[PDB]
């Protein structure tokens, strides 16, 4: 599921209080036992 | 099923195909070929008194 909304102001880092429904993006039919998760960030430190 | 099919002005999402009313009855369905949303209105019924 995915959703992309723009926040109002760059206030202190905290989840903005509000209801935003997330519509499904993709439903990949694959079966794998997943017990861990790790994000992939772009270094781009230069 | 049976009923009259009419072009509905319902804002069907791209991922949604069927549409139900307050009961578990299909009120609108998207055409699988032309991707058109049609409303399913029941046929003309009613009571008869003599």
């Amino acid at each position: 599921y995915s959703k992309h909304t723009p926040i109002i102001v760059r206030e202190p880092e905290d989840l903005p209080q509000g209801f935003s429904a997330l519509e499904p993006l993709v439903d990949l039919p694959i079966g794998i036992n997943i017990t861990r998760f790790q994000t992939l960030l772009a270094l781009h430190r230069s | 099923g049976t009923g009259v099919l009419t072009e509905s002005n319902k804002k069907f999402l791209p991922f949604q195909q069927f549409g139900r009313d307050i009961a578990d009855t299909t009120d609108a369905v998207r055409d699988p070929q032309t991707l058109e949303i049609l409303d399913i209105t029941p046929c003309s019924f009613g009571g008869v008194s003599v």
Side-chain angles (χ1 to χ4, degrees), chain A residues 1-9 11-46, chain B residues 1-6 8-35 37-50:
Chain A
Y1 304 98
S2 301
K3 186 59 178 299
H4 183 272
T5 58
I7 69 174
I8 300 300
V9 69
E11 57 104 8
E13 294 291 339
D14 183 69
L15 297 179
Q17 184 174 1
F19 195 95
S20 60
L22 297 88
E23 31 272 2
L25 213 291
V26 275
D27 299 323
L28 301 323
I30 184 61
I32 171 64
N33 183 21
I34 303 175
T35 61
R36 285 135 59 94
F37 159 71
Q38 182 177 8
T39 178
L40 303 187
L41 65 149
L43 195 62
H44 296 354
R45 299 301 174 89
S46 300
Chain B
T2 172
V4 183
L5 300 179
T6 176
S8 60
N9 302 90
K10 309 173 66 180
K11 299 300 179 300
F12 269 80
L13 281 311
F15 69 95
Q16 298 174 168
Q17 321 87 199
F18 298 91
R20 299 180 186 272
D21 198 327
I22 62 177
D24 190 70
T25 54
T26 301
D27 184 69
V29 60
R30 177 177 297 182
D31 195 310
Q33 296 183 1
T34 180
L35 288 315
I37 42 184
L38 304 178
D39 198 323
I40 303 181
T41 60
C43 206
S44 301
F45 63 95
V48 175
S49 300
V50 177

